[PDB]
Design a protein around this nucleic acid. Sequence first.
RNA 1: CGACUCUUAGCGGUGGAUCACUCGGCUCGUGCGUCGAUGAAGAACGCAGCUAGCUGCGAGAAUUAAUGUGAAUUGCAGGACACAUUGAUCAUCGACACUUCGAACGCACUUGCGGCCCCGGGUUCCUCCCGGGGCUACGCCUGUCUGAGCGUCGCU
RNA 2: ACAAAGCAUCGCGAAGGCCCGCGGCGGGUGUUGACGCGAUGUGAUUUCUGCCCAGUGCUCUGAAUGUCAAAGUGAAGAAAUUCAAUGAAGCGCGGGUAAACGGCGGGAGUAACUAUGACUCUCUUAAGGUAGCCAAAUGCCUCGUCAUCUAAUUAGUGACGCGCAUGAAUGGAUGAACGAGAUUCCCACUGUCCCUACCUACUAUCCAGCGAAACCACAGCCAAGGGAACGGGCUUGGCGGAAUCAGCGGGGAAAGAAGACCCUGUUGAGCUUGACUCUAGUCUGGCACGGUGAAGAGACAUGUUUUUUCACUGACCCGGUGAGG
RNA 3: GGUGGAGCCGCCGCAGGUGCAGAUCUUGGUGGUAGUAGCAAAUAUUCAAACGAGAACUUUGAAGGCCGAAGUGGAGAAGGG
RNA 4: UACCCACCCGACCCGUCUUGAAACACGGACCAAGGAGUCUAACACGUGCGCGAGUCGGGGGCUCGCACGAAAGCCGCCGUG
RNA 5: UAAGGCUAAAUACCGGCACGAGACCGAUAGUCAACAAGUACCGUAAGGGAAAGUUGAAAAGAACUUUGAAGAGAGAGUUCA
RNA 6: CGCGACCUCAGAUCAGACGUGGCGACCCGCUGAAUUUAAGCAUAUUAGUCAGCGGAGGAGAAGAAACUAACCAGGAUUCCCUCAGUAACGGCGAGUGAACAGGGAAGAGCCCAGCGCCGAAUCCCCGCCCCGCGGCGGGGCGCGGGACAUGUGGCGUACGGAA
Lengths: 50, 86, 244, 135, 53
Amino acid sequence: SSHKTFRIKRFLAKKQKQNRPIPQWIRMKTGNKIRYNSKRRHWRRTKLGL
Amino acid sequence: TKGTSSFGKRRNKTHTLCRRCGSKAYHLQKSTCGKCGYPAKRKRKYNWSAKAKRRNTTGTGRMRHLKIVYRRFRHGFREGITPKPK
Amino acid sequence: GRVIRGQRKGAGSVFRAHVKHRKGAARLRAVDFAERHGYIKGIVKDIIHDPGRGAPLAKVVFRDPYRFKKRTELFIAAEGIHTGQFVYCGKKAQLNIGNVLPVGTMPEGTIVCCLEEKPGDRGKLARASGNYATVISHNPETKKTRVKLPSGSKKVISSANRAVVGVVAGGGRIDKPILKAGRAYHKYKAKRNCWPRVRGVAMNPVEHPFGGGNHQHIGKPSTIRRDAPAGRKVGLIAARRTGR
Amino acid sequence: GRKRPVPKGATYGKPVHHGVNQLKFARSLQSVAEERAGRHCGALRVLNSYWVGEDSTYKFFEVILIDPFHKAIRRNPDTQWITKPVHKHREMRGLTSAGRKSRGLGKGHKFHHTIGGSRRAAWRRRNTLQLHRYR
Amino acid sequence: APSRNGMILKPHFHKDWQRRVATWFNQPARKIRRRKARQAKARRIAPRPASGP
RNA sequence: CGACUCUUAGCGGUGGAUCACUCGGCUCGUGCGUCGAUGAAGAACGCAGCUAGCUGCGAGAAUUAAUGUGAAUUGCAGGACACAUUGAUCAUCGACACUUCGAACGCACUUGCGGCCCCGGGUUCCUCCCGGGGCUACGCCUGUCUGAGCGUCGCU
RNA sequence: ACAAAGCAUCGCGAAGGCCCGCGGCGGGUGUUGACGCGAUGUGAUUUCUGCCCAGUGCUCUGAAUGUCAAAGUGAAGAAAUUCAAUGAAGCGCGGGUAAACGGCGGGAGUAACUAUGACUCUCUUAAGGUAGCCAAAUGCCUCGUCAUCUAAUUAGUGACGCGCAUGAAUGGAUGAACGAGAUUCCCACUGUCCCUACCUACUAUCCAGCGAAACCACAGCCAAGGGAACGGGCUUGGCGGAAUCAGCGGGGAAAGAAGACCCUGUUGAGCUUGACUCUAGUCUGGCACGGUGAAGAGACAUGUUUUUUCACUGACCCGGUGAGG
RNA sequence: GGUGGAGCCGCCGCAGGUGCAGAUCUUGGUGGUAGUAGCAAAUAUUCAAACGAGAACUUUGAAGGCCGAAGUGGAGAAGGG
RNA sequence: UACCCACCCGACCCGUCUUGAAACACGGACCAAGGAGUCUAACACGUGCGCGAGUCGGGGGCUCGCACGAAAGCCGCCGUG
RNA sequence: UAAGGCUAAAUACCGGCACGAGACCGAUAGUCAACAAGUACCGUAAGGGAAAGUUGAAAAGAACUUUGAAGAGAGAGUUCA
RNA sequence: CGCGACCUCAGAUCAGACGUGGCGACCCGCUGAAUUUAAGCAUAUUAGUCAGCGGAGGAGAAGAAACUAACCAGGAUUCCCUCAGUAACGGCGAGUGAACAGGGAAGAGCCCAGCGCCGAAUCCCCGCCCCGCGGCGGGGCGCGGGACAUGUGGCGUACGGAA
Ligand SMILES: [Mg+2]
Ligand SMILES: [Mg+2]
Ligand SMILES: [Mg+2]
Ligand SMILES: [Mg+2]
Ligand SMILES: [Mg+2]
Ligand SMILES: [Mg+2]
Ligand SMILES: [Mg+2]
Ligand SMILES: [Mg+2]
Ligand SMILES: [Mg+2]
Ligand SMILES: [Mg+2]
Ligand SMILES: [Mg+2]
Ligand SMILES: [Mg+2]
Ligand SMILES: [Mg+2]
Ligand SMILES: [Mg+2]
Ligand SMILES: [Mg+2]
Ligand SMILES: [Mg+2]
Ligand SMILES: [Mg+2]
Ligand SMILES: [Mg+2]
Ligand SMILES: [Mg+2]
Ligand SMILES: [Mg+2]
Ligand SMILES: [Mg+2]
Ligand SMILES: [Mg+2]
Ligand SMILES: [Mg+2]
Ligand SMILES: [Mg+2]
Ligand SMILES: [Mg+2]
Ligand SMILES: [Mg+2]
Ligand SMILES: [Mg+2]
Ligand SMILES: [Mg+2]
Ligand SMILES: [Mg+2]
Ligand SMILES: [Mg+2]
Ligand SMILES: [Mg+2]
Ligand SMILES: [Mg+2]
Ligand SMILES: [Mg+2]
Ligand SMILES: [Mg+2]
Ligand SMILES: [Mg+2]
Ligand SMILES: [Mg+2]
Ligand SMILES: [Mg+2]
Ligand SMILES: [Mg+2]
Ligand SMILES: [Mg+2]
Ligand SMILES: [Mg+2]
Ligand SMILES: [Mg+2]
Ligand SMILES: [Mg+2]
Ligand SMILES: [Mg+2]
Ligand SMILES: [Mg+2]
Ligand SMILES: [Mg+2]
Ligand SMILES: [Mg+2]
Ligand SMILES: [Mg+2]
Ligand SMILES: [Mg+2]
Ligand SMILES: [Zn+2]
C-alpha cells in the first residue's frame, strides 16, 4: 500500500517469514512424514488473507 | 458490463482485521465486527450454526490458563506449600 | 406488494432536508422586560439570503440588557427593511415597517407578518416570501384578536403574541415561469429530494395503487377516504369537490 | 399488556397466530419490576417486592434487595442462604414470590402440568419413549 | 391406507420421538450404584435398622 | 512374412482396486464434576545453535525453581557436566514468572493523546525535557468526608 | 416509453396535513408556515376543454323515529338469568362534485328524375358524442370509394365519412425548432443488382515445436417391404477392396438444455379485486387515571338519576429562556 | 502352475450396514475423438559478435522500424505485498 | 469344455415406461470401488416352544472388583399390575 | 389454611476432566479430521471446507567404474527380496 | 441572618467489598414459527417443539398441603413400574390425551412476620494486645465510631404457643 498502519505492517512481517522452505536436516529426524513445506504462498496466486 | 468489467473497479475494502476476533470481518462503515460483534460486550455465538460454533470454543485455542486449572484440581487445589525438601 | 414512494418520505435518510448551507432558523427574539413592558432597540446588519427560502433574512443586532454583550438574531425581513435601519421591538414600539409589536396594540387592518400562533413561540405564521396577515378586530377582555392568514382563513389569537409589521420581502417569486427542467432540479437541490415526480399510472401495480394496465389509465376513483390506510391514501385526499 | 413486535401487522403465517394487538404477557408486572431491579444491581440479590401506588399508565412496585457479602448477612444464619451461589438472580429464573406464580405450580387437581419439577420438565417426562433395556 | 379388517391404531409418533428417546443401558449399572449406597449407609450407622425407622 | 486391424496369450507400462495390517474414530458404561477484574475463553506478535509447519511456551520465553527419577539428549553439531554428582534427561508440579489485544478498565483505536502521584538524569522542583515505578473504566453495597434544599422544624 | 417546464385539481392554520416506528412525552417533511408542505392527474406554445351526479367513489354545521354493542340503566326470578326502555360512529335517507372513476343509443314517413333527405313522427336514457379529426399507430367487412404519384402500386400523399370500435386534461385539434424515432417519393451516387472479375493483408494449407474440447449403446453404402404406421442393423434385392489428405454441409430425426408452448398435479409463486378468513392502522363509545367550585334543567319519585352550561388549576398537556424582574 | 510375504478356512448354530450393468447414480481412473481444433487483434524485422554442452527467442554492437509527448515516456493514489 | 481360425444354419441393443420398442422413444464412452425395503413401536394372522384357568414380566430387591458380567442365579417379591 | 422463607437423598447429563469396554468401522468405511485438519483453499462477509496412512527388520537408502550439458542410463554393490 | 437537629438528595481516584464476560450436554424463566399431517384447507396438527433471549449449578427445579379423597380413609417433593393410549379434547376427524389409588427407589424436616414478652437483651466497622493465620477467625480490652425505637436479639409460629 506504501501508506501502511503498524498492525498491517506486522501482519506482512509474519507472513513474509513463514514463506521460506524446510531446513534440509529436518528430513533426517527419526519419525518424519514431511517432505516439502506445502504451506507456502506466492503473491500472484493466493493473495493474502486481505 | 456487470461482470469482468465491474469486477475491475474494486479497490476499496469494506472489512478489515477485528481486534477481538482476529478475523478479517470488521465492518469499517458500520464499526461492528460481524463475526463476534465487536463493540457489543457479548460474543456473537449462535445455537444456529453448530459448525461455526465448534470453530472457536473452549479448547480450540491455547487454554493457557484453564489447562492448568484442570491440573490443580486433579491434585487438590492446594497452594502456599512446597514438597518436602532434600 | 411494495412500499410506495410517499410511504418512504417518513423514514427520511434520503427524503431528508438538505440543510448544510442554511443560515439558521428564522426566529423572533424571545421575550423579557424589553418586550413585555418597554421598547428595546436594535440595528440591521445585513440582508443575507438563505438557500431553500424565497424570503431574505436579516441579521439584526440588539444588545442584551442584562450582560455586556451583543445578541444577534435572524428576522424574516419585511419588504422595505434596509441595512442600517433601526428596528424597535416590544410593547411600547411605534407602528412602522419592521418594528415588532404585540398584535393587541396595533389597530385593525394593520398588515403584519412573521406572526406567532401562541405567545412566545418566536414567529410562526405568514412568513413565506410575499405573504402577510391582516389584523381584523380586537376583543379587549378575554385578550383575544381575530387575524386573517394568507390562506384566507380567519383565526382567533391571544392578544399577547407578537408580529413584525409589513409584508415579507421577495413578493412575486411565483410570477416568473421556471421555464426549463434545469431550473427546477437546480431549485430543489437546495430543499430536499422531491423531484422529478413520477406519476403513479406509469408504475407497476406493486409500487403504486394507480398502476398496471394495458393502457395507462387509473382504474378506480381517484378520490379516497380520509380514513384510509397509508399506501392507499393517494390521489385526491378527502376531496370535497373535484373540478375547476 | 403486550404488543407482538412484528414490523407491521405483518405476522406471517396462518391466521391463528395472526394476532398482534390484544395479547398479554405470561409473567406478571411485579415480576418485571423485580427483574429490572436485580438486573441493574448485579451485586445485590432480589428478595421480595410489594405494591405502593399506581397510575393509568404506571404501576409502582418496590423491591427489597440484599447485599450478599456484607458481614451483617454473612455471619447471621437464616440469611446466609442468600450468599450461596445457588441464589444468584432469583428473579431471572422465576424464584421470588411473584415470579413463581407465573410458573403455575402448587399441589392438587389444579396443578397437573408442572407435576414434575416445572412446566417444562412436566412434559419432558411425558413425551419420552421409555425404551427399556429388556422390553 | 387400511386393508381388510385390522384395528384403528392411533400410535403416538407424530410429534418428535427420536430426539427424546431414553435408553436404559444404565439399568444394570444403576442396580449397582444403589447397592453400594444401600450398603454404605448401613455400615455408616452400624447398630441401627438398615431398613430405616 | 509387406502395413494397418482384430482376437488371444508372454512380458513391459498406466493406474491404483483387492488383500493384510492400524498410536484413529464411533457406541456404551464408570468416577469426577474443575472458568473470570488477584484479570477468563478467544485472538495477535514473539521465543530453538542450525527451525518453516504442528506442538510447547511468554522478553526468565522449545521453559523457571522444586520433588521424584536416576544416565542421557540425538538430524547434525555443540557442549557442560566429574553419571560418588538436585545428577543428564523425562514425569510430576505445590515455589516464581504472565508480551499485546480481549468483560479490557485514564480517552480513543491512528496505535494517538492524556492527567495525577512518586524515583533516577535534567532540575538542585525550575518547569520543561528525558528515563523509571503507582494510580486514573462503568454499576452498586456498607461505612467516611464535603456539601445542597422558601423540606420539617428547633434555637436565636 | 419516462422525465420535463406548463396547466390543473386535492388535503392542511401545527393536539395540522402526509408520513415513519415495536416502544417512548419517538422520529421525517421541519434550520419549515399556504408565493409553504404533502397528494394526484395531464404534458411546451397556439386554439379549445361539449353534454351526463343514474352507477361506483369522495364529500357535506346535512335528517340519523330506519337499524346498532360494550357498558350503562329498568323489570321478573331464588340465581345463573331472562325480558325492557335507549341508540355512536358507520351504515340507511337527503344535498354537492366529472381537470373523480367513468358514460355519451334504436326506429318510419316525407322535397318535381332516381337517390338523398332540410322537415315531421314514435321509443328509450343519466346524457344520448357537440368543436373538431379519420380507412390515422384507432376501420371488422378491406387490395373502402375517388384523385394523384407509376409502363404497372394491397405501398405513399390528398379528399370522401352511419366512424366493427375516433373525439375533448382517460385531453381534442394544430406545429416552428429538434430526433442514432416510423414510413413514402425524387435528385445525386454507387459491385445492391444484370454478372461477376481481379489485387492486397491475415488465415486456413504443409513443416518444427507445443497441444485441447463437445460428443460416444454398438456403430456407420442404398431401394422396397413390413415394423411404434419415415431403419444403420431386420426380410428381399442392389452390392462391398486396405490406410488416408483437402473440402463439404444431404443424412446421423447430430450436439447444446429432464421443452419456455399445451394439458395434468387437489405443486407453487408474482400481481388484482365485488373471492373466503383475517389482520396493522384509523373513526366512534365505554371504563380507568379524572379533581375543585358554580349555577340551572329535565326524568322518576313524593330522595335518586340524567346531568346540560359557565367557570378553577393541583394532576395532565404544549410554548419559551442561560428558567432574570 | 506362478507371485506374494502373514495369517486363514471346513462343519453345527447365532448376527448382519450381505451379492450390482443401469439410477443425466457418487468418487477415482482411462480411452476414442487426436497428434486433431488450435498457438491469426495493434504494420518489422536483419547482420555480426559474445556467452555458452545447446541460440530464430539472451546480451553487446550495427541497420531498419513503430509508440510520437490526450505516449509504449517520467512520477503518485487505492490496491498489491 | 476353455485359446485362435474356418465354415453351414440361426441371429437387430441392453435397461425402462408401455395396448405395442431393434426403434426416427429416453438412460448407457469404458473400468474399478461405493450404492437402495432398514430399525423402533403398535396391531393382525400363521408357525415353534414353556406352562396351562392361569401365565408372566417389569420395575425393584437379594448375590461383585465383571475377566468372561454391565451376564447367570435367586426373591410370601409372582401379582401391586 | 393460601397472599412470606429455607432443605439433603434417590433424579438428568451428545459440554469438560479422567478412565473402562465392544457379536462396531476398518483408509471412498469410521467424526469434516488415523497425516502440519477445522489445516490448505474459496467467498467482501455471514460462512463454505478438502484431498492425503503402509520401503525394509536394519537405511544396510546404491560407494565405485562408465556414458551423457544434465535428467537418465550400463556395470557394480546392498539385501531373504 | 446566623448557628443546630432531622428528612430528602448530591459529589468524591475517599476506607473496604462486589457485579459484568466465557461455557453451555443436562437445568430454570420468557419468546415462539413454518415445512408437515388432515390426501384441498382456514380450526386443529407439527407444538410450547426449531431458532431467538435471558439465567444458573455440580446437579438444577420442586418440597413440608389453602393436597388427596369419599375409604374401616390416606399424608412434603423427585424418579421408576403401573394406571393406559384409559377419563376427557377434537371441521368429535387427523389426531391429541392426564391424573387418583397400588408397588418400589429414596426417605428429614423446618424457619419467619405478626400477637406478645423481655432496660436493644442486638449488629456492623474502627484502635490496642493474646492465640490463629495458603478457605481471616476466635479471646479480651477500649465514652473509638455507626446502624436500630419508622424496630435489631432471646423464647415462639399454628403439629399448637406463651404465661
Ligand atoms: Mg491477480
Ligand atoms: Mg411500465
Ligand atoms: Mg396494490
Ligand atoms: Mg425403602
Ligand atoms: Mg498384450
Ligand atoms: Mg500387468
Ligand atoms: Mg486413494
Ligand atoms: Mg435546609
Ligand atoms: Mg385528472
Ligand atoms: Mg370534459
Ligand atoms: Mg354520484
Ligand atoms: Mg361528429
Ligand atoms: Mg392530418
Ligand atoms: Mg415503391
Ligand atoms: Mg389517407
Ligand atoms: Mg485442417
Ligand atoms: Mg434436424
Ligand atoms: Mg386429482
Ligand atoms: Mg398460493
Ligand atoms: Mg368480502
Ligand atoms: Mg511385514
Ligand atoms: Mg457389519
Ligand atoms: Mg460392488
Ligand atoms: Mg500510427
Ligand atoms: Mg518507472
Ligand atoms: Mg403410446
Ligand atoms: Mg420409427
Ligand atoms: Mg421420460
Ligand atoms: Mg408456604
Ligand atoms: Mg485414501
Ligand atoms: Mg485400501
Ligand atoms: Mg475419511
Ligand atoms: Mg500404498
Ligand atoms: Mg493401498
Ligand atoms: Mg519379494
Ligand atoms: Mg453470566
Ligand atoms: Mg395437507
Ligand atoms: Mg399430499
Ligand atoms: Mg398444500
Ligand atoms: Mg393451524
Ligand atoms: Mg402448542
Ligand atoms: Mg432453543
Ligand atoms: Mg435448590
Ligand atoms: Mg426452593
Ligand atoms: Mg403424592
Ligand atoms: Mg390395558
Ligand atoms: Mg398438544
Ligand atoms: Mg420482635
Ligand atoms: Zn470480531
